[PDB]
């Protein structure tokens, strides 16, 4: 009898497929929590799932996609707790709704492409940043559409993700180079469109993914090239920062301590930046193309009370 | 006034296109990816006609298979479309005496010979015709002609001298004229006996023919007796103004913009580039009219339909057009 906390349920099926990502894995674990542990009373169910979400955030704090999944699960159990079935059917009604995310959010990524293929037009040199697999889910259907384009992939120092794209869509058959991440300003005068992928959307439209998407965003603004971001609808999160600095990793982004003998010195600054709403200009979700004030309204309506 | 009749008389230029044109007529050749009947037909449907009469002197079955599979034998077409089957290679003119022996045409009607492509609002050509009716009871027709003033010498087969009036633009006289390759034939003659009561006239070379003549139903009856005519203008408009029948004057109209007619490949190239460029507004290509294409328009004059596979590392320059389902490759230009 599993306890669903850390790895007795969650981290097992992350090794089943390296295509499922973190937040829908969190959705799958949280629905299979109360799919079995349903002790016929509406009180301790919500206590169990709130305890489970807080210990799962307590497992890995610096992967804020997890917070997005573990909080839209609370929105799911709140709205499915609504319609007021007196808990007599909801013990069966909520769990038969249940797996509609793993039948729904799993097949959201081609629904992204079905509305985002009509962005990359003919002969567009494209800049992507980091292994954001929804961007590749758009680009796969774009190359299957037989449309002519070129791609440029940045480095993802120190998180290594930029080396994956050049070994991902090269074998699909797209002419692609791998620029280094510092060389954006000398090339973004030539890049037609730039895509990124978020690990979170704030309450105004923000990109909380990686090391330097604020840098490539402010390069996109002072080259006046359109800065799109491909995401999907399990990436909304309540966390609305105000600076370019989020929750810390373990200390401040500006360390000034002493290296003892030979410890690592690359990851000493920040690793997850923030982008304001001005630098993004259109984001892609399951809900269509979505201007950032629309994503602000969409995350302002389902989070108030 | 209304109930406009019409007659298109194709299939007189098979001498021009002889390596082609023996397996399908001149009128069924794709100028811009679609066989150019409708480049006349959409024009004179916008002119608002009610019946046409396709003379098909050759390949008559592969006229009517396209005509019955067109959008014109469907019960909302602005004209009903009828054909005329034919023994082979009749000279023009005698088709009108065959028409008068049959006796269908009553009223004003278009003598559109050849295959034209134009932007002219034919509606404002009606009031020129009716001003001809009101200010002359001895009229014959009106002849719309283009003003291609920036180029003589390059309208290939026949250069002409449309000498006409200053004030009323009545066509005074007409004469065929030789070619720039011939330095030999250097004279034309206009004898001044019929030049008595004109006192003001203009003689121009920069008017290209387009064979769009609209007249009254009196002039086929005029044309009935004088059975000597075999062309439409080398013999007739000379032989109707040269003091032959008294009290029958012919008029001719000049437009200000693009209105052209197919002669040969040294005109087919030029009109293909004028139509495929934006020199033919509003009768343009990207509007996707004829056989419900999907042409889009980039800058630099690019025309592409859906399902076009442009391969990588190709370049596509000015003024091109690509149909659907094609496939180009690497390194092409």
Coordinates of C-alpha atoms in Angstrom, one line a residue:
Chain A
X1 CA 0.0 0.0 0.0
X2 CA 1.8 3.1 -1.3
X3 CA 2.0 6.4 0.5
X4 CA 2.3 8.6 -2.6
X5 CA 4.8 11.1 -1.0
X6 CA 8.2 11.2 -2.7
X7 CA 9.3 8.2 -4.7
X8 CA 7.0 5.3 -3.7
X9 CA 4.6 6.6 -6.3
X10 CA 5.9 9.8 -7.9
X11 CA 9.5 9.2 -9.0
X12 CA 8.7 5.7 -10.3
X13 CA 6.8 6.7 -13.4
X14 CA 9.2 9.5 -14.2
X15 CA 11.5 6.6 -15.3
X16 CA 8.7 5.1 -17.3
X17 CA 8.8 7.8 -20.0
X18 CA 11.3 10.6 -20.7
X19 CA 8.5 12.5 -22.5
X20 CA 6.2 13.3 -19.6
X21 CA 7.3 16.4 -17.8
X22 CA 7.1 17.4 -14.1
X23 CA 3.7 19.1 -13.6
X24 CA 1.6 16.5 -15.4
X25 CA 3.5 13.9 -13.4
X26 CA 2.4 15.8 -10.3
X27 CA -1.2 15.9 -11.6
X28 CA -1.0 12.1 -12.2
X29 CA 0.4 11.4 -8.8
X30 CA -2.2 13.7 -7.1
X31 CA -5.1 12.2 -8.9
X32 CA -3.9 8.6 -8.1
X33 CA -3.6 9.7 -4.5
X34 CA -7.3 10.1 -4.0
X35 CA -8.2 7.6 -6.7
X36 CA -7.3 4.9 -4.1
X37 CA -7.1 6.7 -0.7
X38 CA -10.7 7.9 -0.5
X39 CA -11.8 7.2 3.1
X40 CA -15.5 8.1 2.6
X41 CA -15.4 11.6 4.3
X42 CA -14.9 15.0 2.7
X43 CA -12.8 16.2 5.6
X44 CA -9.6 14.2 5.6
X45 CA -9.5 14.0 1.8
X46 CA -8.5 17.6 1.4
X47 CA -6.2 17.4 4.4
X48 CA -4.5 14.5 2.8
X49 CA -4.1 16.2 -0.6
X50 CA -2.9 19.5 1.0
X51 CA -0.4 17.6 3.1
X52 CA 0.8 15.7 0.0
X53 CA 1.2 18.9 -2.1
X54 CA 3.2 20.6 0.6
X55 CA 5.5 17.6 1.2
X56 CA 5.9 17.3 -2.6
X57 CA 6.9 21.0 -2.8
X58 CA 9.2 20.2 0.2
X59 CA 10.8 17.5 -1.8
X60 CA 12.1 19.7 -4.6
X61 CA 11.6 23.5 -4.1
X62 CA 13.6 24.9 -7.1
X63 CA 11.4 23.3 -9.8
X64 CA 8.5 25.8 -9.7
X65 CA 6.7 23.8 -12.5
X66 CA 5.9 21.4 -9.6
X67 CA 4.2 24.2 -7.7
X68 CA 2.1 25.0 -10.8
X69 CA 0.9 21.5 -11.1
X70 CA 0.3 21.0 -7.4
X71 CA -1.7 24.2 -7.3
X72 CA -3.9 23.7 -10.4
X73 CA -4.7 20.3 -8.8
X74 CA -6.1 22.3 -5.9
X75 CA -8.1 24.3 -8.4
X76 CA -9.3 21.1 -9.9
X77 CA -10.5 19.6 -6.6
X78 CA -12.1 23.0 -5.7
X79 CA -14.1 23.3 -8.9
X80 CA -15.0 19.6 -8.9
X81 CA -15.9 20.1 -5.3
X82 CA -18.2 22.7 -6.6
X83 CA -21.4 21.8 -8.4
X84 CA -22.4 20.5 -4.9
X85 CA -23.1 16.8 -5.3
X86 CA -23.5 16.5 -1.5
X87 CA -20.3 14.2 -1.5
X88 CA -22.6 11.2 -2.1
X89 CA -21.8 11.1 -5.8
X90 CA -18.6 13.1 -5.6
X91 CA -16.7 10.1 -4.1
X92 CA -17.4 8.5 -7.5
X93 CA -18.0 11.7 -9.6
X94 CA -14.7 13.3 -8.7
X95 CA -12.7 10.1 -9.4
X96 CA -14.5 9.4 -12.6
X97 CA -13.6 12.9 -13.7
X98 CA -10.2 11.9 -12.4
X99 CA -8.0 10.7 -15.2
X100 CA -9.5 13.3 -17.6
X101 CA -6.2 15.2 -17.2
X102 CA -4.1 12.2 -18.3
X103 CA -6.5 11.8 -21.1
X104 CA -6.5 15.6 -21.7
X105 CA -3.2 17.2 -20.6
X106 CA -1.2 14.4 -22.2
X107 CA -2.7 15.2 -25.6
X108 CA -2.5 18.9 -25.2
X109 CA 0.9 19.2 -26.8
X110 CA -0.3 18.5 -30.3
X111 CA -3.2 20.8 -29.7
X112 CA -0.5 23.4 -29.1
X113 CA 0.9 22.7 -32.6
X114 CA -2.5 22.8 -34.3
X115 CA -2.8 26.5 -33.4
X116 CA 0.9 27.4 -33.3
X117 CA 2.0 26.1 -36.7
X118 CA 0.5 29.2 -38.3
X119 CA 3.1 31.5 -36.6
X120 CA 6.4 30.2 -38.2
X121 CA 5.9 31.5 -41.8
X122 CA 8.1 30.8 -44.8
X123 CA 11.9 31.3 -44.4
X124 CA 11.9 32.4 -40.7
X125 CA 15.2 32.0 -38.9
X126 CA 14.1 30.9 -35.4
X127 CA 15.8 31.4 -32.0
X128 CA 14.9 28.9 -29.2
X129 CA 16.3 28.8 -25.7
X130 CA 16.5 25.7 -23.5
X131 CA 14.9 22.3 -23.8
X132 CA 11.2 23.4 -23.8
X133 CA 9.5 20.4 -25.3
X134 CA 6.3 22.2 -26.2
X135 CA 8.4 24.3 -28.6
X136 CA 9.7 21.1 -30.2
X137 CA 6.1 19.8 -30.3
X138 CA 5.3 22.8 -32.4
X139 CA 8.4 22.5 -34.5
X140 CA 7.8 18.8 -35.2
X141 CA 4.4 19.5 -36.7
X142 CA 5.9 22.5 -38.5
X143 CA 8.5 20.4 -40.2
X144 CA 5.8 17.7 -40.9
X145 CA 3.7 20.5 -42.5
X146 CA 6.6 20.8 -45.1
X147 CA 7.2 24.5 -44.4
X148 CA 10.6 26.1 -45.0
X149 CA 12.5 27.6 -42.0
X150 CA 15.8 27.6 -40.1
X151 CA 16.5 27.3 -36.4
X152 CA 19.2 28.6 -34.1
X153 CA 19.6 27.1 -30.6
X154 CA 21.3 28.9 -27.7
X155 CA 23.4 27.3 -25.0
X156 CA 21.7 26.8 -21.6
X157 CA 24.5 27.3 -19.2
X158 CA 24.8 25.8 -16.7
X159 CA 21.7 23.6 -17.2
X160 CA 23.0 21.9 -20.4
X161 CA 19.6 22.0 -22.2
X162 CA 20.9 23.7 -25.3
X163 CA 22.9 20.7 -26.4
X164 CA 19.7 18.6 -26.5
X165 CA 17.9 20.5 -29.3
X166 CA 20.8 20.1 -31.7
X167 CA 20.6 16.4 -31.2
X168 CA 16.8 16.4 -31.5
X169 CA 15.6 18.2 -34.6
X170 CA 18.8 17.7 -36.6
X171 CA 17.8 14.0 -37.0
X172 CA 14.4 15.3 -38.0
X173 CA 16.1 17.1 -40.9
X174 CA 16.1 20.8 -40.2
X175 CA 19.1 23.1 -40.9
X176 CA 20.1 24.2 -37.4
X177 CA 23.2 25.7 -35.8
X178 CA 24.1 26.0 -32.1
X179 CA 24.9 29.5 -31.1
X180 CA 26.6 30.1 -27.8
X181 CA 24.4 31.9 -25.3
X182 CA 26.5 35.0 -25.0
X183 CA 26.4 35.6 -28.8
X184 CA 22.7 36.6 -28.9
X185 CA 23.2 40.3 -29.4
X186 CA 25.3 39.9 -32.5
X187 CA 22.8 37.5 -34.2
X188 CA 19.4 38.7 -33.0
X189 CA 19.6 41.5 -35.6
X190 CA 19.2 38.7 -38.1
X191 CA 16.8 36.4 -36.3
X192 CA 13.3 36.8 -37.5
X193 CA 11.3 35.3 -34.6
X194 CA 12.4 34.1 -31.2
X195 CA 10.6 31.4 -29.2
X196 CA 11.1 30.4 -25.6
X197 CA 9.3 28.1 -23.2
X198 CA 8.2 28.9 -19.7
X199 CA 8.5 27.0 -16.5
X200 CA 5.8 29.2 -15.0
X201 CA 3.5 32.2 -15.8
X202 CA 3.1 34.9 -13.1
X203 CA 0.0 37.0 -12.5
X204 CA 1.0 39.5 -15.3
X205 CA 2.7 37.3 -17.9
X206 CA 6.2 36.2 -17.0
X207 CA 8.8 33.7 -18.0
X208 CA 10.2 32.0 -14.9
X209 CA 12.1 29.2 -16.7
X210 CA 15.8 29.4 -17.1
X211 CA 19.0 31.4 -16.6
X212 CA 18.8 34.1 -19.2
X213 CA 15.4 34.5 -20.9
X214 CA 15.3 38.0 -19.5
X215 CA 18.5 38.7 -21.4
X216 CA 17.2 37.3 -24.6
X217 CA 13.9 39.1 -24.0
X218 CA 15.6 42.5 -23.6
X219 CA 17.7 41.7 -26.7
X220 CA 14.5 41.0 -28.5
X221 CA 13.0 44.3 -27.4
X222 CA 16.0 46.3 -28.5
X223 CA 16.1 44.5 -31.8
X224 CA 12.3 44.8 -32.1
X225 CA 11.9 41.2 -33.1
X226 CA 8.7 39.5 -31.8
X227 CA 9.2 37.5 -28.6
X228 CA 6.8 34.6 -28.5
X229 CA 6.6 31.8 -25.8
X230 CA 5.2 28.4 -26.3
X231 CA 3.7 26.8 -23.2
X232 CA 0.6 24.9 -22.2
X233 CA -2.2 25.3 -19.7
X234 CA -0.7 23.4 -16.7
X235 CA 2.0 26.0 -16.2
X236 CA -0.1 28.7 -14.5
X237 CA 1.3 29.5 -11.0
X238 CA 0.3 32.0 -8.3
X239 CA 3.9 33.2 -7.7
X240 CA 4.0 36.8 -8.9
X241 CA 7.4 38.4 -8.3
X242 CA 8.1 42.1 -8.8
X243 CA 11.9 42.2 -9.3
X244 CA 14.0 40.2 -11.7
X245 CA 14.6 37.9 -8.7
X246 CA 12.3 35.0 -7.7
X247 CA 12.4 32.7 -4.7
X248 CA 16.1 31.9 -4.0
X249 CA 17.8 28.7 -4.9
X250 CA 19.5 28.3 -1.5
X251 CA 20.9 31.8 -0.9
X252 CA 21.0 35.1 -2.8
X253 CA 21.9 35.4 -6.5
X254 CA 25.0 37.4 -5.5
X255 CA 27.2 35.1 -3.4
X256 CA 30.5 36.4 -2.0
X257 CA 31.7 33.5 0.1
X258 CA 35.0 31.6 -0.1
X259 CA 35.6 28.5 -2.2
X260 CA 37.2 26.1 0.2
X261 CA 39.5 24.0 -1.9
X262 CA 38.2 23.1 -5.4
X263 CA 34.4 23.3 -5.2
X264 CA 32.2 24.3 -8.2
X265 CA 32.2 27.9 -9.3
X266 CA 30.0 28.0 -12.4
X267 CA 26.6 27.9 -10.6
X268 CA 27.2 30.8 -8.3
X269 CA 24.8 33.4 -9.7
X270 CA 21.1 32.8 -10.3
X271 CA 19.6 30.1 -12.4
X272 CA 15.9 31.1 -12.8
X273 CA 15.3 34.7 -13.9
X274 CA 12.1 36.6 -14.5
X275 CA 10.7 38.5 -17.5
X276 CA 8.2 41.3 -17.2
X277 CA 5.0 41.5 -19.3
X278 CA 6.4 44.1 -21.7
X279 CA 9.1 41.8 -23.3
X280 CA 6.7 39.0 -24.1
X281 CA 4.1 39.8 -26.8
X282 CA 2.1 36.6 -27.4
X283 CA 2.0 33.3 -25.6
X284 CA 0.5 30.0 -26.8
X285 CA -1.6 27.7 -24.7
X286 CA -4.5 25.3 -25.0
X287 CA -6.7 28.4 -24.8
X288 CA -5.6 29.7 -28.1
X289 CA -3.2 32.5 -28.8
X290 CA -3.1 34.6 -25.7
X291 CA -1.9 38.2 -25.2
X292 CA -0.2 38.7 -21.8
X293 CA -3.0 40.8 -20.4
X294 CA -5.3 38.0 -21.3
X295 CA -3.2 35.5 -19.4
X296 CA -3.2 38.0 -16.5
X297 CA -7.0 38.0 -16.5
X298 CA -7.1 34.2 -16.9
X299 CA -4.8 33.9 -13.9
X300 CA -6.7 36.7 -12.0
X301 CA -10.1 35.1 -12.3
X302 CA -9.5 31.5 -11.2
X303 CA -7.4 32.5 -8.2
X304 CA -9.5 35.2 -6.5
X305 CA -12.4 34.5 -4.1
Chain B
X1 CA -30.8 50.1 -73.3
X2 CA -30.3 46.9 -71.3
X3 CA -30.4 43.2 -72.3
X4 CA -26.9 43.2 -73.6
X5 CA -26.0 40.6 -76.2
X6 CA -22.5 39.5 -77.0
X7 CA -20.4 37.3 -79.3
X8 CA -16.8 36.1 -78.8
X9 CA -15.1 34.9 -82.0
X10 CA -12.0 33.0 -81.2
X11 CA -10.0 30.5 -83.3
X12 CA -8.5 32.8 -86.0
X13 CA -4.9 32.9 -84.8
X14 CA -3.9 29.2 -85.2
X15 CA -1.2 30.4 -87.6
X16 CA 0.5 32.1 -84.6
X17 CA 0.9 29.3 -82.2
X18 CA 1.6 26.4 -84.6
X19 CA 3.9 24.0 -82.5
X20 CA 1.1 24.2 -79.9
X21 CA -2.5 24.8 -80.8
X22 CA -3.0 21.7 -82.9
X23 CA -4.1 19.6 -79.9
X24 CA -6.2 22.3 -78.0
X25 CA -7.2 25.7 -79.3
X26 CA -5.6 29.1 -78.7
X27 CA -8.4 30.1 -76.4
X28 CA -7.8 27.1 -74.1
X29 CA -4.2 28.0 -73.2
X30 CA -3.2 28.9 -69.7
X31 CA -1.9 32.4 -69.6
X32 CA -1.6 32.5 -65.8
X33 CA -2.2 28.8 -64.9
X34 CA -5.8 28.9 -66.2
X35 CA -7.0 28.8 -69.9
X36 CA -7.7 32.3 -70.9
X37 CA -11.4 32.1 -72.0
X38 CA -12.4 33.5 -68.6
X39 CA -10.0 36.5 -69.0
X40 CA -12.5 37.6 -71.6
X41 CA -15.5 36.0 -69.9
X42 CA -15.2 37.6 -66.4
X43 CA -14.6 40.9 -68.1
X44 CA -17.7 40.8 -70.3
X45 CA -19.8 39.3 -67.4
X46 CA -18.8 42.4 -65.4
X47 CA -19.9 44.3 -68.5
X48 CA -23.3 42.6 -67.9
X49 CA -24.2 40.6 -71.0
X50 CA -27.0 38.1 -71.3
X51 CA -25.8 35.7 -74.1
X52 CA -22.5 34.8 -75.8
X53 CA -21.9 32.8 -79.0
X54 CA -18.5 30.9 -78.9
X55 CA -17.4 30.3 -82.5
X56 CA -15.3 27.1 -82.3
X57 CA -13.7 26.6 -85.7
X58 CA -11.4 23.8 -84.5
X59 CA -11.4 21.2 -81.7
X60 CA -15.1 21.9 -81.0
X61 CA -15.5 19.0 -78.6
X62 CA -12.8 20.1 -76.3
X63 CA -14.4 23.5 -76.2
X64 CA -17.8 22.3 -75.0
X65 CA -16.4 19.8 -72.5
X66 CA -14.8 22.6 -70.7
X67 CA -17.8 24.9 -71.2
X68 CA -20.2 22.3 -69.7
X69 CA -17.7 21.8 -66.9
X70 CA -17.3 25.5 -66.3
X71 CA -19.1 27.8 -63.9
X72 CA -21.2 29.2 -66.8
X73 CA -23.6 26.3 -67.4
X74 CA -24.9 26.6 -63.9
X75 CA -28.3 28.4 -63.3
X76 CA -27.0 31.6 -61.8
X77 CA -24.5 32.7 -64.5
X78 CA -25.0 36.4 -65.5
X79 CA -25.2 35.3 -69.1
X80 CA -26.3 32.0 -70.6
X81 CA -23.6 30.6 -72.8
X82 CA -24.2 29.1 -76.2
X83 CA -21.7 27.8 -78.8
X84 CA -21.6 27.6 -82.6
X85 CA -20.1 24.5 -84.2
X86 CA -18.2 25.1 -87.3
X87 CA -16.5 23.7 -90.4
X88 CA -12.8 24.3 -90.1
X89 CA -11.0 27.6 -90.7
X90 CA -13.6 30.1 -91.7
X91 CA -12.4 33.6 -92.3
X92 CA -14.0 36.2 -90.1
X93 CA -16.9 38.3 -91.3
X94 CA -18.8 35.5 -93.0
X95 CA -19.6 34.2 -89.5
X96 CA -21.8 37.4 -89.2
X97 CA -23.6 36.7 -92.5
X98 CA -24.2 33.1 -91.2
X99 CA -25.5 34.8 -88.0
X100 CA -27.8 37.0 -90.1
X101 CA -29.0 33.9 -92.0
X102 CA -29.7 32.4 -88.6
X103 CA -31.0 35.6 -87.2
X104 CA -30.6 35.7 -83.4
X105 CA -28.9 39.0 -82.7
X106 CA -31.1 42.0 -81.9
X107 CA -29.6 45.1 -80.2
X108 CA -26.1 46.2 -79.2
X109 CA -23.5 43.5 -78.8
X110 CA -19.7 42.9 -78.4
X111 CA -17.6 41.9 -81.4
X112 CA -14.8 40.6 -79.1
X113 CA -12.4 38.9 -81.5
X114 CA -9.3 37.2 -80.2
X115 CA -8.7 36.9 -76.4
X116 CA -8.4 40.0 -74.4
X117 CA -7.3 41.0 -70.9
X118 CA -8.3 44.4 -69.6
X119 CA -9.3 46.6 -66.7
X120 CA -11.5 49.1 -68.5
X121 CA -14.9 49.8 -67.0
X122 CA -17.2 49.0 -69.9
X123 CA -20.0 50.9 -68.1
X124 CA -18.4 54.2 -69.0
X125 CA -18.1 53.0 -72.6
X126 CA -21.9 52.7 -72.8
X127 CA -22.4 56.5 -72.5
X128 CA -19.9 57.1 -75.2
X129 CA -22.0 54.7 -77.4
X130 CA -25.2 56.4 -76.4
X131 CA -23.7 59.9 -77.0
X132 CA -22.8 58.5 -80.4
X133 CA -26.5 57.5 -80.8
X134 CA -27.9 60.8 -79.7
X135 CA -25.5 63.1 -81.6
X136 CA -25.4 60.9 -84.8
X137 CA -28.1 58.9 -86.6
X138 CA -25.5 57.6 -89.1
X139 CA -23.3 55.7 -86.6
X140 CA -21.8 52.2 -87.0
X141 CA -19.9 51.2 -83.9
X142 CA -17.3 52.3 -81.2
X143 CA -13.8 50.9 -81.2
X144 CA -12.1 51.0 -77.8
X145 CA -8.3 51.2 -78.1
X146 CA -5.5 51.6 -75.6
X147 CA -3.0 54.4 -75.3
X148 CA 0.4 52.7 -75.3
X149 CA 2.2 56.0 -76.0
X150 CA 5.5 55.0 -74.4
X151 CA 6.2 52.3 -77.0
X152 CA 5.7 52.1 -80.7
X153 CA 7.5 49.5 -82.8
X154 CA 7.0 46.6 -80.4
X155 CA 3.4 45.6 -80.9
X156 CA 4.5 42.9 -83.2
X157 CA 2.3 41.6 -86.0
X158 CA 0.3 44.6 -87.3
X159 CA 1.2 48.2 -86.8
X160 CA -1.7 50.4 -87.7
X161 CA -2.5 54.1 -88.3
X162 CA -5.8 54.8 -86.5
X163 CA -6.3 58.3 -87.9
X164 CA -9.3 59.8 -86.3
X165 CA -11.1 63.0 -85.3
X166 CA -9.9 65.7 -82.9
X167 CA -13.3 66.5 -81.3
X168 CA -15.6 63.6 -81.8
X169 CA -13.0 60.8 -82.2
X170 CA -14.7 59.6 -85.3
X171 CA -12.4 57.2 -87.1
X172 CA -11.4 58.9 -90.3
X173 CA -9.4 56.3 -92.1
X174 CA -7.3 53.2 -91.6
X175 CA -4.3 51.7 -93.2
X176 CA -2.0 48.7 -92.6
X177 CA 1.7 49.6 -92.0
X178 CA 4.9 47.6 -92.3
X179 CA 7.4 46.3 -89.7
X180 CA 10.6 47.7 -88.2
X181 CA 12.6 44.8 -89.7
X182 CA 11.7 46.2 -93.1
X183 CA 13.5 49.4 -94.0
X184 CA 12.1 49.2 -97.5
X185 CA 8.4 49.9 -97.4
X186 CA 8.3 53.6 -96.5
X187 CA 5.0 55.4 -97.4
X188 CA 1.4 55.5 -96.5
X189 CA -1.3 57.4 -98.4
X190 CA -4.5 59.2 -97.2
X191 CA -6.3 60.7 -100.1
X192 CA -7.9 64.0 -99.2
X193 CA -11.2 63.7 -101.1
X194 CA -13.1 62.3 -98.1
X195 CA -11.1 64.8 -95.9
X196 CA -13.4 67.6 -97.0
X197 CA -15.6 68.4 -93.9
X198 CA -13.3 67.2 -91.1
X199 CA -11.0 70.2 -90.6
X200 CA -9.4 68.7 -87.5
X201 CA -7.9 65.2 -87.3
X202 CA -5.3 63.2 -85.5
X203 CA -3.2 60.3 -86.9
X204 CA -1.6 58.0 -84.3
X205 CA 0.4 54.8 -84.2
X206 CA 0.4 54.3 -80.4
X207 CA -3.1 52.7 -80.3
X208 CA -2.9 48.9 -79.9
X209 CA -5.8 46.9 -81.3
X210 CA -8.0 44.9 -78.9
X211 CA -10.9 44.0 -81.2
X212 CA -13.6 44.9 -78.7
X213 CA -16.2 46.5 -80.9
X214 CA -19.8 47.3 -79.8
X215 CA -22.2 48.4 -82.4
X216 CA -25.9 48.3 -83.3
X217 CA -27.9 45.6 -85.0
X218 CA -28.1 47.6 -88.2
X219 CA -24.5 47.0 -89.2
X220 CA -24.7 43.2 -89.7
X221 CA -27.6 43.9 -92.0
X222 CA -25.3 46.5 -93.7
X223 CA -22.6 43.8 -93.8
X224 CA -25.0 41.3 -95.4
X225 CA -25.0 42.7 -98.9
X226 CA -21.4 43.7 -99.3
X227 CA -20.1 40.1 -99.4
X228 CA -16.5 41.1 -100.3
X229 CA -15.2 41.4 -96.8
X230 CA -13.0 38.7 -95.2
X231 CA -11.2 40.5 -92.3
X232 CA -12.6 42.8 -89.6
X233 CA -10.5 45.9 -90.1
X234 CA -8.0 45.5 -93.0
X235 CA -11.0 45.5 -95.3
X236 CA -14.2 46.4 -93.4
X237 CA -13.5 49.6 -91.5
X238 CA -11.6 50.8 -94.6
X239 CA -14.4 49.6 -96.9
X240 CA -17.2 51.2 -94.8
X241 CA -15.7 54.7 -94.5
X242 CA -14.1 55.1 -97.9
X243 CA -17.2 56.8 -99.5
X244 CA -18.7 53.4 -100.2
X245 CA -22.0 53.6 -98.3
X246 CA -23.2 57.1 -97.7
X247 CA -24.3 58.2 -94.3
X248 CA -22.6 55.5 -92.3
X249 CA -19.9 56.8 -90.0
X250 CA -17.8 54.6 -87.6
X251 CA -16.5 55.9 -84.3
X252 CA -13.5 54.8 -82.1
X253 CA -12.9 55.2 -78.4
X254 CA -9.6 55.7 -76.6
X255 CA -9.1 54.7 -73.0
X256 CA -6.4 55.8 -70.6
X257 CA -5.2 52.5 -69.1
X258 CA -4.4 48.9 -69.7
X259 CA -6.4 47.0 -72.3
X260 CA -4.6 44.4 -74.4
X261 CA -5.1 41.4 -76.7
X262 CA -3.0 38.3 -77.5
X263 CA -1.1 38.4 -80.7
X264 CA 2.0 36.1 -80.4
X265 CA 4.6 35.1 -77.9
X266 CA 6.4 38.5 -78.2
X267 CA 3.1 39.8 -76.9
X268 CA 2.2 36.8 -74.7
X269 CA 5.3 37.3 -72.6
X270 CA 4.6 41.0 -72.2
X271 CA 1.0 40.6 -71.2
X272 CA 1.9 37.7 -68.9
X273 CA 4.3 39.9 -67.1
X274 CA 1.9 42.8 -67.0
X275 CA -0.9 40.6 -65.6
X276 CA 1.4 38.8 -63.2
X277 CA 2.8 42.1 -62.0
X278 CA 0.4 44.6 -60.5
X279 CA 0.0 46.5 -63.8
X280 CA -3.5 45.1 -64.2
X281 CA -5.4 46.4 -61.2
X282 CA -8.0 45.3 -60.3
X283 CA -8.1 42.3 -62.6
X284 CA -5.2 40.7 -60.8
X285 CA -4.1 37.1 -60.0
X286 CA -4.1 36.8 -56.2
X287 CA -7.9 37.2 -55.9
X288 CA -8.3 33.4 -56.6
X289 CA -11.4 33.6 -58.9
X290 CA -11.2 31.3 -61.8
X291 CA -10.8 27.7 -60.7
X292 CA -10.8 28.5 -56.9
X293 CA -7.1 28.6 -56.5
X294 CA -5.3 29.6 -53.2
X295 CA -2.8 32.2 -54.4
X296 CA -1.1 34.3 -51.7
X297 CA 0.9 37.4 -52.3
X298 CA 4.2 38.2 -50.7
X299 CA 6.2 41.2 -51.7
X300 CA 8.6 41.0 -54.8
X301 CA 5.6 39.7 -56.8
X302 CA 5.4 36.1 -55.5
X303 CA 2.4 33.9 -56.1
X304 CA 2.0 30.6 -54.3
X305 CA -1.0 28.4 -53.8
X306 CA -1.5 25.9 -50.9
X307 CA 0.6 22.7 -50.7
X308 CA 3.7 24.2 -52.3
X309 CA 6.8 22.4 -51.3
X310 CA 9.6 25.0 -51.5
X311 CA 12.8 23.0 -50.6
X312 CA 15.6 24.4 -48.5
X313 CA 18.3 26.7 -49.9
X314 CA 16.2 27.8 -52.9
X315 CA 15.7 31.4 -54.0
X316 CA 12.6 32.8 -55.8
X317 CA 13.1 36.2 -57.4
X318 CA 10.8 38.8 -58.9
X319 CA 7.4 38.2 -60.6
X320 CA 6.9 34.5 -60.2
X321 CA 3.9 32.2 -59.8
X322 CA 3.8 28.6 -58.5
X323 CA 0.7 26.3 -58.5
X324 CA -0.3 23.8 -55.9
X325 CA 1.3 20.4 -55.2
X326 CA 4.6 21.2 -56.9
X327 CA 8.1 20.3 -55.6
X328 CA 11.2 22.3 -56.2
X329 CA 14.6 21.1 -55.0
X330 CA 18.0 22.2 -53.5
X331 CA 20.0 24.9 -55.3
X332 CA 17.2 25.9 -57.8
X333 CA 16.6 29.4 -58.9

